[PDB]
Amino acid sequence: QNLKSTDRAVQQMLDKAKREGIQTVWDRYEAMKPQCGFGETGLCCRHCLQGPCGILPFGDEPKVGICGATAEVIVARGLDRSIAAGAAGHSGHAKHLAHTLKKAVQGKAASYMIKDRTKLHSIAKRLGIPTEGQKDEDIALEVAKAALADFHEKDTPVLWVTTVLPPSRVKVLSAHGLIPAGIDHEIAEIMHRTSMGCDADAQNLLLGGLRCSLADLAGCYMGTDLADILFGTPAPVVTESNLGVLKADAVNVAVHGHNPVLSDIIVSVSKEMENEARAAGATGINVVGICCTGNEVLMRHGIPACTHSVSQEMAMITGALDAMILDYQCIQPSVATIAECTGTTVITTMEMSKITGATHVNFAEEAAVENAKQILRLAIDTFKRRKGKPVEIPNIKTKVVAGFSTEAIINALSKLNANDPLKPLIDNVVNGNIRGVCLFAGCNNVKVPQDQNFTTIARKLLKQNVLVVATGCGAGALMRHGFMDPANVDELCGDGLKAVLTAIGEANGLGGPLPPVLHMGSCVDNSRAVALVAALANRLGVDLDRLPVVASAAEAMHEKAVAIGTWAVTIGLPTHIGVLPPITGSLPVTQILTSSVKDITGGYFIVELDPETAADKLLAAINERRAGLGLPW
Amino acid sequence: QNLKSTDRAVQQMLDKAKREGIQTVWDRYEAMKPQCGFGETGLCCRHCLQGPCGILPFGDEPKVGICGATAEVIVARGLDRSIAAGAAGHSGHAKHLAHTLKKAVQGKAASYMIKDRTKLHSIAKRLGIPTEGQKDEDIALEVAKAALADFHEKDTPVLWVTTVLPPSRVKVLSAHGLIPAGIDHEIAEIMHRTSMGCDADAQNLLLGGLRCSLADLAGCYMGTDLADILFGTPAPVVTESNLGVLKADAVNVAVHGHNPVLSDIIVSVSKEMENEARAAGATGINVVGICCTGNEVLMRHGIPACTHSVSQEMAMITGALDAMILDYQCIQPSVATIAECTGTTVITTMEMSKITGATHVNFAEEAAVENAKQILRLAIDTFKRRKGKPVEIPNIKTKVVAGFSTEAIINALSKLNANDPLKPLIDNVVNGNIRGVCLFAGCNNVKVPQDQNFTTIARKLLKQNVLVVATGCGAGALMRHGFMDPANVDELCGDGLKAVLTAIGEANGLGGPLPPVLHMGSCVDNSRAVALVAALANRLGVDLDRLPVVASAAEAMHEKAVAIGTWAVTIGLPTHIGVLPPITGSLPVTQILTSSVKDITGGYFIVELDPETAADKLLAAINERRAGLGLPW
Ligand SMILES: CC[n+]1ccc(-c2cc[n+](CC)cc2)cc1
Ligand SMILES: CC[n+]1ccc(-c2cc[n+](CC)cc2)cc1
Ligand code: SF4
Ligand code: SF4
Ligand code: FES
Ligand code: FES
């Protein structure tokens, strides 16, 4: 049972679900085995009606597609479409945020406003939008219009690419034609070139995929920018994680998905419906988070992290989850069925993301408070239906210190050097106190036992003084196993890393160290790491592919994770992926994505499914980057 | 051997290829069997790294995806992505045309110009772009800017949707939220909603797919519009089809792909290099067409149709094909390999479409004549290498009368009624002389013996007085079996259809009838049929779903064909598809796409793999539409 998840509460709820005959994601995975060898090697194509075409990894015919598409062509086309799908997800997230900001500053959504004036000003200056002597709503409208225009061809390339990376990096990517012209333009061109009879050259397809991954990076950066403008830039905050944050005597409302435009309003309206909740016979409206919108409200408001990714269903298995408010992106549709057994009202709110069997509430920024009142009223009804009945909420919760936006990190460092905030960090990088930086990102994969790779690699990296930051469900796993709790620094961190964390934390008025891992936010907030990594780059006069910075999609599952890893490579990072991507069916594509892209961008993928070996490989990558700079290791 | 193709020349070249051990598409198809039952039923998903997930069509587990995605959800997501890929192809085609027009009228491409002033004026009037008292290049620039803007969100919806269908049809599609906001916007939203954890409601996904199919329709209409502005609106023309159009004593240059922006320049520059060809020891530069760019030059310049679709390789099997100029879209990459055995120089010209092993010439409208001179010089070299050596060009060619643009059709009808050109056609529809209209469209599929479905259904429809028009490789098949030759009217057409064709042809100054099938152009020129079908709609005061008009993707292969069939349904047509699409794995999705969409758009798919039964079903659909109007049948 410990082979399905390393989270103890998840094991408890798996026992409960097995008890009651509630089918789980691990059960469905067990029904799916043996899985198909063509697809999970990437050697399968259904790109037209002459298919499906499978190419045996080794042996006799079939060796080539019916139309003549080779193994590498098929592999590259599939990977390109994965990158495009992830880019579409992130880009639509940011597109909805841009629409919300425009509507707010045009007077069409009064529940939304400019909550971070300073970030709006700095973004407008970064884009060349004039701020001085201009109405705040005027420059916000201009910023939203620039964001919307970055989705198509225009006078300029994608500004959320070209103005967020150092100019030398932009030059390197422009010398290879990797700079995107428009986000949706790149997505459509990927869909065009990978369809039948089009592009059939592996190197060409992989370069196009790098461009599409940069479009995804632009989408992530824009989403972070607009969410910070509308809802505020996160600052350090203390909260709790895992299922134990649920309360049998409260109205449990879990916000699940990626777009915060809805759940941020939920967090506010719930406090106003506190009295209504009391009238129902409840202590209050206990709002918890699931997946990335949960991480957004965790970073901005200290909302507890109920659960993440592959184990989302386990929340409903408590029996005390009265509402699950879904927007889109990584909701298992199984919840809609599982609700029937758990007395959970599952509520979709977005037009392009509905699930069969769930109540739908058509969200609109013009009626966000109205929608939220209706939804939480349904949640109150659901609580009323279960008064006095038995629930099993595992009494398991960790302490989580989060809210480490790049702005907050720079400020906390400025406590040690007011005029050159990055200098203390670079100093400790030089003297060995900080070996390097690792970004943990991505989701949980049902094939990898939950949180095993993240915790294992994190332990091996922290004991060697790697400054570890995390986002999304990587942050979720590490926070559910105690890595955002400073009380574990002594157990987890090496001496130099402990000293650096202690120095910053004691300079930041909390008497103790920073938590062993810095939670940088959601899946799109990976852009935050870019913002940090580029900044240090600018401070050191070098390109990212010269920094001892690595990334780890240790348990990657989603197409967005593939796009994120691809643009982590593209901006120049060594990027470990801890699950097998569908590239092993063609040695040329694997060699390009792990070896020869070093000649193109300086980054490269590291495919390794053993977390001990993967941690050693990440350590070696960090140490080679250190050596290239002339640093001991 | 007749089981692989009904084209006699193709059978001859298949015998030659088998003789010499040249692997063919039919051979590769034979290596691919048995094909996978999950994919060709649509019951397979690889939309994230937890897959591949297969759902058995019948029996025990696996019954549901690992994440809980049902059979219908998986089927709808796959079909949605197919529609998006086809839309991306057509839209990128039209996008490149828009860029070429803008560059031409800004002074950046002197080889391109406004060749149809009248079509530019009428398009500008249809869009509300003011023509009166404006420079032709100014309104052309405005038209190109509107075309480019239709690819993203703006003040208005997609104008190439909303201004080309009758306003009642636009109202019907707007009542269901089917009107696209932007072409690339819709494509990206399809990629977003079909990725993991997003949309999981079959009806929702299919409605989104209808919207994306309308985006594809807009792309087709825009491509036709811009190609007509730059290169001219086709008029009737006489030429020849099949391999016999190749000449052993000429420099054989075959233009292959979809975008005419290149091959139209090739057609002109070749005549200027005629003297160079003579110097090489050749009679001239024999330019032939393959697939849809070949059909474009056939409709505009009377360039012979060498071959189409699944049999393209057979051209190289003649041994006398010296050059194959590929842009993109439906080129079998096998040609790049097959060239090594046939002495054929295969030349890619587009950045996003290269093939491993082929010479690449970077095309640019700023250097189109320069590129063309280089490419045809390589072709002359290739001819020089083969002087006096043996070739086998089958002496098989049919007569093809084509160039039937909607403008040309309206003019030919105006010969019978100068002020109400559509009235004679509607008159003969009423009195039974014309039973209905069938649009043949789409490609050849290696599973269906080549051209069998097209010819069979065409015979059964023509003998019952259906006015038959065709595009793309449907036109290619029907023209290679003699359906564009008026000399066959007596053999093919029923008495009333023969009388109508004879009346129009004798009124049009050629003493004989029109050909049994009206060639309306390329794959995007399906929009032409829309232009006709809408026009009659406007003349009759009814919606398309009330017209006795049907469509037939009789041997569909490409994702573009799926998108085309979907928007044929969406605008309200009964639409037969003659190959199995990946929808039969879910009865609900099949029922929606064949039965209940009648309540939504009035059109519906007809899935039938037997061409006799399919022809009967098309006949019955035409007759039901006749009955709804109160007409005998
Ligand atoms: C022959 C087709 N095929 C290729 C690869 C695998 C596979 C790869 C990695 N892992 C995790 C170690 C498991 C399975 C299974 C099947
Ligand atoms: C069980 C999986 N599966 C489903 C359908 C077919 C199939 C369908 C139609 N045709 C043409 C008549 C051939 C095969 C084959 C396999
Ligand atoms: S595009 Fe090629 S490999 Fe893919 S299904 Fe079609 S014929 Fe097979
Ligand atoms: S999205 Fe669902 S059905 Fe598709 S591969 Fe992932 S888990 Fe399987
Ligand atoms: S045959 Fe298994 S993924 Fe296609
Ligand atoms: S298992 Fe055959 S298409 Fe995926």
From Swiss-Prot, chains A, B:
Keywords: 4Fe-4S, Cell membrane, Cytoplasm, Iron, Iron-sulfur, Membrane, Metal-binding, Nickel, Oxidoreductase. Binds 3 [4Fe-4S] clusters per homodimer. Inactivated by O(2). [Ni-4Fe-5S] cluster binds at residues 258, 292, 330, 443, 473, 523. It catalyses: CO + 2 oxidized [2Fe-2S]-[ferredoxin] + H2O = 2 reduced [2Fe-2S]-[ferredoxin] + CO2 + 2 H(+). Homodimer. [4Fe-4S] cluster 2 binds at residues 45, 48, 53, 67. It holds the Pfam family Prismane. Belongs to the Ni-containing carbon monoxide dehydrogenase family. This is Carbon monoxide dehydrogenase 2. Its main location: cytoplasm. One of its GO terms (biological process) is response to hydrogen peroxide. GO terms for molecular function: 4 iron, 4 sulfur cluster binding; anaerobic carbon-monoxide dehydrogenase activity; hydroxylamine reductase activity; nickel cation binding; peroxidase activity. The gene is cooS2. GO terms for cellular component: cytoplasm; plasma membrane.
